[PDB]
Design a protein around this ligand. Sequence first.
Ligand SMILES: NC(=O)c1ccc[n+]([C@@H]2O[C@H](COP(=O)([O-])OP(=O)(O)OC[C@H]3O[C@@H](n4cnc5c(N)ncnc54)[C@H](O)[C@@H]3O)[C@@H](O)[C@H]2O)c1
Ligand SMILES: NC(=O)c1ccc[n+]([C@@H]2O[C@H](COP(=O)([O-])OP(=O)(O)OC[C@H]3O[C@@H](n4cnc5c(N)ncnc54)[C@H](O)[C@@H]3O)[C@@H](O)[C@H]2O)c1
Ligand SMILES: O=C(NC[C@]1(O)CC[C@H](COc2ccccc2F)CC1)c1ccc(O)c(F)c1
Lengths: 285, 294
Amino acid sequence: NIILDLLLLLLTIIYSYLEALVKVFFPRKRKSVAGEIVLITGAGHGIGRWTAYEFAKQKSRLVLWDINKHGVEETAAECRKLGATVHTFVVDCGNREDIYNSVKQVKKEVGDVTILVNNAGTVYPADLLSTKDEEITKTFEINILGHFWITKALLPSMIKRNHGHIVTVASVCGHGVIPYLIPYCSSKFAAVGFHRALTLELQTLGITGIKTSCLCPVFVNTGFTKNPSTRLWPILETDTVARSLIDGILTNKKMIFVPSYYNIYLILDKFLPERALAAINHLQN
Amino acid sequence: NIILDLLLLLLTIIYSYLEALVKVFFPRKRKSVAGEIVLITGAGHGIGRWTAYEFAKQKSRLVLWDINKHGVEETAAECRKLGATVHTFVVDCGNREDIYNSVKQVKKEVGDVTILVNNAGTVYPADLLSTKDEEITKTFEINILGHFWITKALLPSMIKRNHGHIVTVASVCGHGVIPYLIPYCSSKFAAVGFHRALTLELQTLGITGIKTSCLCPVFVNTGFTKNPSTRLWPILETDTVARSLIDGILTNKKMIFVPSYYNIYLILDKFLPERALAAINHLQNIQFEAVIGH
Ligand SMILES: NC(=O)c1ccc[n+]([C@@H]2O[C@H](COP(=O)([O-])OP(=O)(O)OC[C@H]3O[C@@H](n4cnc5c(N)ncnc54)[C@H](O)[C@@H]3O)[C@@H](O)[C@H]2O)c1
Ligand SMILES: NC(=O)c1ccc[n+]([C@@H]2O[C@H](COP(=O)([O-])OP(=O)(O)OC[C@H]3O[C@@H](n4cnc5c(N)ncnc54)[C@H](O)[C@@H]3O)[C@@H](O)[C@H]2O)c1
Ligand SMILES: O=C(NC[C@]1(O)CC[C@H](COc2ccccc2F)CC1)c1ccc(O)c(F)c1
């Protein structure tokens, strides 16, 4: 396993260098998001909090949602320090009725959301037979079902004006799988599927102004899960993931992997049947 | 589009011939399923009904589940004609409490299930803004959440005996997407994710005796979806899909696409230059009755 470990380091180094080379040779155009009404769910901590900071620097109008009232007020105070106008609401993003009532409030107090970042997430790591049925339902209610209710509530206005951006925060767990996270991986696959089907349906209907982005990071140091011993993937910092997300949104990138070189592990999976799967699985344990 | 059509036709003719060549050069071993207790969900019609017929010919003991008592008893009558012992139960496979109570009944009247075929599914074709929230919940309750409850109830015995086979009936919609089927595609991606994560967790735990299979067919002529039309994929017959499934199960195949050459369309998607996606989308011309605006 020494040879495959060093080979993958070089493949990672080659991809990371060639990406930065293409980023200078063929730069992608960056749109403006100043004055857009951006709703961010799960904005009281982690990826959502630092994504709100990126949108505050971008001069957007923010609408922050979370069940953690103290947390979302801490994010809002920093966004205001950054010069942004912020509105916070305590919303359970896995409760359909709470979402619809809160959208009525956002329309009355702020206006029509133009960028939706479905970031709120939940996880209860455990093997399948050690999970609680309530936790499995909670995982689907927040990680995918809530994406349907928020998107359904906010899409009508975006379609009317032919202008919007729906961002789905999924995970590399929506493309690949990790043991002890069966319900979580299943809901993250569901999140990727929703992003892909929504993207295709907007093209089929002739709706050219509504963009879609899907954020798929590896483990991020937010406290979301206990720290692992992952030698191949990096233990990302929150600010780095929020920077990758804002860059992807401004550039209309449909699938944003963090780190971007994760796409090689995905390409290797579709061309690997099947004894070489376990060899790379033990290089990260 | 004449040039790209012949390029796709050649890649389908070559795959179908090379598969039959590998099927003779490196044949896969077919296990026996005689005497296994096989639970088939949604067995009152379509894929589930004809899969039950394949397992009846294989000499397994069948446990058929469905909300339609009339249909599941009609499938059981034919399985009995085929020489099989069959037990039917009226179970809502999207209801957690109904599932657990029914598993207690299956243990008392039949025994411990060894092969679970999570086949029951639903779909409500419509664009996202024309869907009903009840339909979105129903889609997830049956197409994925029910897979969790049934698997959780039946896995303990399989782990105790180091012997089982969990079959998840997903769709090509769990790998790719079709417009007017956003909630359905999302639920089918979740079914594929569950199959893949369950497969990996069994390996990680050292459980070697529990096999997993995932059935991913294109449109099948079962009435599930109305007037399906595909210019590049065929409109499959039910018996063909049930034959592909039984062959995959007996051979411990993890991902069963019907037709098997669909894997080329999936490989082409991961090496897609954006402008070539729309060219094959218009040549495919996927049609089916759905609620688009009205
Ligand atoms: N942290 C990682 O390692 C990681 C890996 C990839 C993807 N993700 C995904 O990124 C997203 C954010 O994760 P994070 O690491 O920033 O987590 P975090 O714990 O730092 O913050 C998540 C936030 O979501 C909020 N939230 C939870 N349930 C909610 C609900 N019902 N309604 C509203 N808000 C709710 C929490 O209160 C919290 O403020 C999630 O979707 C997660 O699955 C995380
Ligand atoms: N038909 C296709 O074109 C097609 C394409 C690929 C995948 N699939 C999948 O194959 C599976 C079977 O579909 P089909 O075409 O055989 O459908 P079908 O309509 O022929 O039969 C489905 C059966 O499931 C039963 N069922 C529905 N809801 C149930 C519930 N709550 N509890 C128990 N039983 C329930 C129905 O009563 C019916 O007997 C589904 O998971 C479907 O998504 C179908
Ligand atoms: O890395 C993420 N979590 C890490 C854990 O907190 C700790 C490790 C276990 C997996 O354990 C093993 C795997 C293989 C062999 C033996 C193990 F013990 C999963 C939970 C994580 C969490 C969310 C994500 O979205 C994501 F991409 C990654």
